[PDB]
Design a protein around this ligand. Sequence first.
Ligand SMILES: [Zn+2]
Length: 155
Amino acid sequence: MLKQVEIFTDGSCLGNPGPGGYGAILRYRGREKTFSAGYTRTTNNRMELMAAIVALEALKEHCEVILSTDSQYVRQGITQWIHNWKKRGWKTADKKPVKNVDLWQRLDAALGQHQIKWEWVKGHAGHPENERCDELARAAAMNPTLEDTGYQVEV
Ligand SMILES: [Zn+2]
């Protein structure tokens, strides 16, 4: 049997682009670890990906992961994009590198480590761990300490 862990994630950004942060909580046997970091110029979507990446990368063995997020962007990538991207070579219909390919590839490498059970939470407000993840993300967004060197500046 695989160990079962619960991961809660959320991302936050003060503009588009603007300073932003991620927040994630990894829970195993009731004990929790938090993750968060803030970036001087990024996007909400990239922070939503980073929260999932960082919590999954913390796992040092194959697990079953109940992964709870309210990110509609992450869902659409998982459902519409990730399969055909591994078939098209991570390119668009016009043979061009897809947006945020650096993080989508990092996520795919962490996701393939585990048995993923997605919990598409409608909204972080309410589910306590998801609420705390929003607080951690906003906290990092107001104290950014890193550059998001993977963000291709669109403005
Ligand atoms: Zn949220």
